Design a protein around this ligand. Structure first.
Ligand code: HEC
Ligand code: HEC
Ligand code: HEC
Ligand code: HEM
Ligand code: HEM
Ligand code: HEM
Ligand code: HEM
Ligand code: HEM
Ligand code: HEM
Ligand code: HEM
Ligand code: HEM
Ligand code: HEM
Lengths: 499, 499, 499
């Protein structure tokens, strides 16, 4: 029983909540976690792609092998000493961290805000005892290099060339069970009522599985280009994304900047929308009066925070804060996806809308919160409708074989991808007249502009769904698509006249 | 007599400066303020649009009605207690504010920089006495929820369902007369010599009136989309825009981030230009060594500020700092507007240029300030000329009925909008071949690129008027317009040959 | 002998390292510096352009003349007094600076991190003695207005109208020899093995010479527009760019924001790529825990910095930090330039790659550093190849005289520029069908999108080379170019049929 983890997760793992020991609970999670039938490995399109050099870091459990360069057999203290010279900043950053400073956590004053960590330390120690990693009357001396890079509570020497590993999600989970299980519970909680999306997605628990299952990613020859997508989809394999390497600060992952590198760009510009909104701007202007060290639960009180942030909003469900960020997903970013809009009035959605009001009501009035969320929905449907109008046109042009080069110069897409109209692959692969200008236009209208229109609406950024983003760009796309349709229509007329 | 308010304002209101009491002065302002003949209400196109749920917040004086949900009759202390649970962050933010902490303002040390507030407190108290809101031998205990949300200095109980209101500009004005009048004086000060713009615009005093008077806004069916424009045009109705809700910090409104959400984007990117300039970058790098609590008047001395900011530059006229931001407007953002360029050499403009040098000369040499402002002007005329060349072309294409679908598929715009070439409505409404690709191109060249070219020039951002913005994009527009004109010209040739 | 300056520089100047006195060393540098045969003056295209008002500031040694406005003969103390009123912020900013506070530097504690400055003070004093600017038993009282704006260690009165100057690089060099020589050594160190770029470029030592030698800059009539390019190319003439005017803070130039105004935009978005990367985001989140006052050499230790920055990475060579930023340049930003890609596997490049690993290895493992730099290269070649495919097409269209208006409406470029296909001038000059839409497309594909693809790769920003920038935009360009080629191909078919 790890209170914050959903029953559903316990059930799926076949575990009895009030009976499962930490060892058992952990064993189950890792079972499913390292199982290829659940998303582990190279995927279904494995025969089409090969890993590049940096891939041993993006997916360790599949590609990482120890660096045979230095033939060294070292101990706990050797790792630090040698690396003081070899990787200077890596040793310093670690030493200045809680992993290297466990004593502080123990001698914490009860009236200190960061006191909750002392409890978290006890918990960890009990997880390790249950797993036989720690003796019953033994404390965790520290969390050093040898612990994460070879074995937890490793005493004896480690062979550098045959023992070094890269810490994956489950490695942290040996101690951070509560966090690991909460994230893994996403596979169980994000399940759509009509299969609009794959069970347990979109999420952080299956983001790498989602990346390797993207046909284009597996078929395109430009592995270096394609790899830039892998970097935004590593959360599943390693836990150093929000709270970065060696320092692993929780205060850092609470700041909006932590999500920014991944949650930005054309098909979703969460970072840009948020930073431009009042919430976001106030977060910039008041970041200095806020105590980011205080956990999310006490942020709006002891933390002094008076403006929402990415984590505050997305990691909160019904007053509880967890590592599972799926529980409130209604639009899953892309409004054009089948059965999404259609599902927006389901009791399923209604119940999640209620959860979102519960989040806005910590500050605003419910009447106010409901007034805006309603606009968010109807506004997304207005941008959606515009896309469908333009799409209706270009789609028939396809049905009629009238797209430029459709009959002549439209080379087939790379295997295992099959030909079609308006496919994602067209956003990353082009050859001759595949895709055709008008096709790419109607495509980017939905995948980029319509997507950004929603993001702007969801993140209270006026110009983000009006002039600057969304409507403005979409208005242009529709106009140009129209303007092209008519030109082609007049060209064909003259064509027939001649023949 | 409120020293900072222009004579013109007194005259227009029919008030004798050295005779008008605060009560009288206030009564006049609100008269014009709530008068539909001056911009209040739904406007001239009221029969075409209806307010949406969130509209009761954007325009309270027209749409707001108390939330009948909770049937409660409360007192001053009840508002706070109940809301401690109901709207947690709203109560905390207020308690931590000067409105909730009036005593501090009174016990202020004379040598303290924030001492001027003590005087501002006395003034307010006198405004209230004159209006019978405060007794002659009585102090303002505090500015709590019941004061702003029902009645100023309200003693007895308030009926939640029938008494609650949303504080509009005039509500703050009951106490903050000096600020209210300074902003309202914009109606009187921003008057152009040749009607290039509507009297009292562009400004914050008539920004909502300007929004509802935008035909497209009133005619377009997408009310949710259209509402994102209302959010950038609320300054007229409420004063919580620069210094946000419940905390109402003056230090906050002095920081560039406060203007950012509205003053950014395609048709004007003041935020982006500024942040990228040296002034702006230095403002980011030195924001921590600056005391933002110090009023604008003492910023460059006691505040330690050594780089200009949005407020420092725009709220300063001739050494004085006011809430009226119109007094120095020469180009009103859009250089293509009729008689603007043409007016750039008028004694009117000359005199405002002198006012701007007076602002730059607090730091730079006049010779230096004049060297750049001159470049700003000639540079804007060079971008303007480029637009006019491309415009000359597409305009004739219109005169000759040769725009794509002009004769056939060019549906009429929504009422009360009338058909035409290159209308603003084309930036927010499209149907078939209205507008036509080339039309939208020549349109966005002026409304977006040319506009941004100027903004870049005015806010010392090199790449903002050269490569990245302005010239670069405009060079492309001209090229593509040209390239299309010739193609259509050759297509018609072959047309005639066949018939 | 100034240890940090390359032998090559000594050799080129004809100086004997262990014999050249500071006076001699300085005399040599300035010789070449003020010599038109090396980049000084108006350049080879001088007869085509004239300086505008603000040009006296961008290139003082060529255009600046004292302001005859005020007829004043002043002394050291007069400059300050009068300017206290005339240029308020200019006097304050200076007074609060080290130039105005030399005593502090002298009484510095040895255990203080900013102690190294005391040594730098001694050095300067010795430079001045050697140049007869300072007496043997004399200290530098201070660095005030009269020193920089008339003469170093000036005693007597200065005539405002005939004596005032604008401090150029060599002016600072009278005291800051070490810094001046390090920057000038760029002319000697950035020399490519196959003339891919002009000797000593790209760099800061010859950035103005590079600007005036840009044909378009000299030929285009829009001097105000063209001047926005001069502002990003002033480093050669003045040293107030990274560490700005009057305060001249070294802590300021160490912060990423200092490079941002110039190193951003379409043809290179270093600022945007960096700020979005983990390195950059961590730099934003941890800028407050870092001591920017500590010199680069001690940043990663005493400074507490645990994330790289623009200066840390670019000013470091082999453990040493200098003002010369050329020593590690492999791709010089634009991958499409002839013989660049081709040179990427030369021992020259290999040796610079090794230098870059030496920089990444202060934190990451070499295996890790090498894994990413490899991806950076192969990834840039994949974006390059895509450009070449599209280019191959449009180029033949040129060879065949089939570009829109190529035979008819393609006006010649302004002198001294000669006609051609895909020239830089086409990015800043357009007339009729010159350039042609397809030409501008293939052009911006390389100069903007391909360039940004690389920058994204070099600055670890995933979306910067995938969706948002690079690949995404380039995929569109290729598609649209293709889509146009086919349309023109079918149009000509029907053409022949008619005739
Ligand atoms: C970081 C800047 C990203 C890059 C580069 C790529 N993706 Fe992406 N992707 C990103 C985010 C933040 C999200 C979530 C968006 C949301 O709000 O839902 C996504 C989403 C996807 C998904 C969809 C969900 C699912 O099917 O499970 C997939 C399949 C996906 N991304 C794959 C993918 C591929 C293969 C890319 C390059 C070829 C690509 N993404 C780039 C952020 C980033
Ligand atoms: C916030 C990001 C905005 C959105 C969304 C919209 N507008 Fe706007 N508008 C904005 C600013 C900051 C300004 C001032 C620009 C300047 O420098 O002058 C404007 C200006 C206008 C005006 C012009 C002045 C006048 O006629 O009085 C009008 C009429 C106006 N804006 C209306 C309007 C409408 C109706 C919009 C959507 C359909 C729209 N704006 C969006 C900022 C923002
Ligand atoms: C600041 C925002 C710039 C503006 C405006 C212009 N240029 Fe530029 N340019 C800029 C940078 C940061 C760089 C270096 C890019 C890199 O990573 O290498 C450049 C480079 C050039 C060069 C190339 C190198 C050389 O030939 O020596 C030249 C010739 C150059 N820039 C000239 C130039 C001209 C004339 C411009 C306007 C007409 C232009 N640049 C604008 C930044 C900026
Ligand atoms: C796996 C690479 C891993 C991650 C990720 C991780 C994260 C993490 C965070 C964010 C903190 C907070 C630090 C702060 O002060 O803000 C933290 C703290 C503790 N960790 Fe950890 N940690 C990772 C791995 C491990 C492993 C393998 C162990 C067990 C040997 C472990 C233990 C602890 C303990 C104990 C603490 C301190 C108490 C607490 O703050 O919870 N971590 N870790
Ligand atoms: C920062 C603390 C942060 C937040 C907040 C956040 C949110 C978020 C949500 C709400 C989702 C759910 C999917 C949906 O749209 O319904 C989600 C999904 C993905 N995220 Fe995320 N995310 C934050 C941080 C991070 C970081 C640091 C990265 C990049 C390494 C990242 C990436 C992604 C990706 C990719 C998805 C994948 C969805 C899928 O394909 O199944 N997130 N995130
Ligand atoms: C990977 C499954 C993973 C682990 C494990 C992990 C651990 C971890 C710990 C131990 C803490 C507690 C530290 C403390 O003392 O407060 C913690 C806190 C936060 N994390 Fe985490 N975390 C993992 C992954 C991720 C990812 C991918 C994100 C970003 C979407 C993320 C974010 C956060 C945040 C926010 C906190 C603070 C939460 C709070 O209630 O204050 N973590 N993490
Ligand atoms: C209307 C919603 C309203 C606004 C807006 C507003 C703003 C405002 C600011 C910016 C301050 C400064 C706070 C700081 O410390 O920086 C401030 C201060 C005072 N106010 Fe106020 N205020 C609004 C409404 C009202 C009303 C209705 C009253 C009168 C009952 C009132 C009074 C005061 C007083 C007094 C002060 C303190 C002294 C001062 O700083 O001027 N406010 N307010
Ligand atoms: C931040 C303190 C801030 C500044 C500075 C500022 C300036 C500004 C100017 C100079 C104008 C005058 C119009 C002109 O271009 O000549 C103006 C006009 C508008 N503003 Fe503004 N503004 C600042 C803040 C705010 C905020 C917070 C918003 C958004 C709610 C905002 C909005 C607008 C709008 C809209 C106009 C309207 C002009 C009209 O239509 O008549 N401003 N602003
Ligand atoms: C709406 C008409 C409105 C009112 C009323 C108002 C009040 C207000 C007060 C009382 C202050 C003084 C607080 C103090 O103690 O210093 C004050 C100060 C500033 N305001 Fe304001 N304000 C109103 C509206 C707006 C708007 C729309 C803006 C942004 C364009 C704005 C900005 C500012 C700024 C800046 C300050 C500080 C000015 C200074 O001289 O320091 N206000 N406001
Ligand atoms: C030329 C306009 C010029 C520049 C540029 C410049 C820069 C510079 C910096 C960045 C500092 C550091 C200040 C800090 O505390 O971070 C600095 C310091 C000193 N300078 Fe200087 N300086 C310029 C010009 C001159 C001239 C003409 C002299 C000689 C009369 C001079 C001297 C000094 C001295 C001495 C110091 C203090 C010691 C040190 O930090 O090196 N400077 N300057
Ligand atoms: C900030 C400390 C900063 C850094 C870092 C930086 C880097 C940089 C490099 C690596 C080059 C070399 C050229 C190449 O790409 O190989 C370079 C060149 C130029 N820079 Fe720079 N630069 C920084 C700061 C500044 C500043 C503040 C400006 C703008 C006034 C600026 C400008 C330029 C320009 C222009 C070039 C010219 C190259 C040429 O044409 O020869 N840099 N910079
Ligand atoms: C122009 C040739 C120029 C001079 C001269 C100059 C001087 C200068 C000094 C005296 C210092 C030392 C100050 C101290 O006490 O630490 C110094 C330091 C830095 N500078 Fe510089 N500088 C000149 C030009 C430039 C330019 C164009 C840049 C930006 C690319 C730049 C940057 C820096 C940085 C960074 C530092 C700190 C270096 C460190 O090792 O800490 N300078 N400069």
């Amino acid at each position: 029983d790890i209170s914050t983890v959903p029953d559903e997760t316990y059930d799926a793992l076949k575990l009895d909540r009030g009976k499962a020991t930490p060892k058992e609970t952990y064993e189950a999670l890792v079972k499913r976690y390292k199982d290829p039938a659940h998303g582990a490995g190279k995927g279904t399109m494995g025969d089409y792609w090969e890993p590049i050099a940096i891939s041993i870091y993006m997916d360790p459990n599949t590609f990482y092998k120890p660096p045979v360069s230095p033939k060294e057999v070292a101990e706990r203290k050797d790792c630090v000493e040698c690396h003081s010279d070899e990787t200077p900043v890596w040793v310093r950053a670690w030493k200045r961290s809680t992993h290297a400073n466990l004593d502080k956590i123990r001698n914490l004053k009860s009236d200190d805000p960061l006191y909750y960590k002392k409890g978290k330390l006890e918990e960890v120690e009990n997880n390790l005892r249950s797993m036989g990693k720690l003796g019953e009357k033994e404390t965790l001396k520290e969390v050093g290099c040898i612990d994460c890079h070879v074995d937890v509570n490793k005493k004896d020497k480690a062979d550098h060339t045959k023992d070094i590993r890269m810490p994956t999600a489950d490695t942290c989970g040996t101690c951070h069970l509560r966090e690991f299980a909460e994230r893994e519970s996403e596979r169980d909680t994000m399940v759509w009522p009509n299969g609009q999306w794959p069970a347990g997605r979109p999420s952080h628990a299956l983001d790498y599985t989602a990346n390797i299952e993207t046909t284009v990613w597996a078929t395109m020859p430009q592995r270096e280009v394609a790899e830039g997508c892998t970097m935004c989809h590593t959360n599943q394999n390693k836990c150093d994304n929000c709270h970065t390497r060696h320092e692993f600060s929780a205060a850092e992952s609470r700041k909006p900047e932590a999500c920014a590198t991944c949650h930005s760009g054309v098909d979703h510009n969460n970072w840009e929308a948020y930073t431009m909104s009042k919430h976001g701007k106030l977060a910039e202007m008041n970041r200095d009066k806020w105590n980011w060290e205080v956990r999310l639960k006490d942020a709006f009180s002891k933390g002094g925070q008076n403006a929402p942030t990415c984590a505050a909003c997305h990691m909160e469900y019904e007053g509880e804060y967890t590592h599972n960020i799926t529980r409130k997903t209604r639009w899953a970013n892309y409004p054009f996806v089948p059965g999404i809009a259609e599902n927006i009035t389901s009791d399923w959605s209604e119940a999640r809308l209620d959860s979102w009001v519960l989040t806005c009501t910590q500050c605003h009035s419910e009447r106010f919160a409901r007034s805006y969320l309603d606009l968010m929905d109807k506004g997304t449907l207005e941008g959606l409708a515009k896309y469908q109008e333009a799409n209706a046109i270009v789609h028939k042009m396809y049905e009629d074989g009238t797209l430029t080069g459709q009959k002549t110069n439209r080379p087939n897409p790379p295997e295992p991808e099959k030909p079609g109209f308006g496919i994602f692959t067209q956003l990353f692969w082009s050859k001759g007249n595949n895709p055709a200008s008008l096709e790419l236009k109607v495509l980017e209208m939905g995948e980029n502009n319509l997507a950004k229109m929603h993001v702007g609406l969801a993140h209270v950024n006026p110009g983000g769904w009006t002039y600057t983003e969304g409507w403005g760009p979409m208005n242009r796309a529709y106009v140009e698509i129209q303007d092209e349709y008519t030109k082609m229509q007049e060209l064909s007329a003259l064509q027939a006249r001649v023949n």
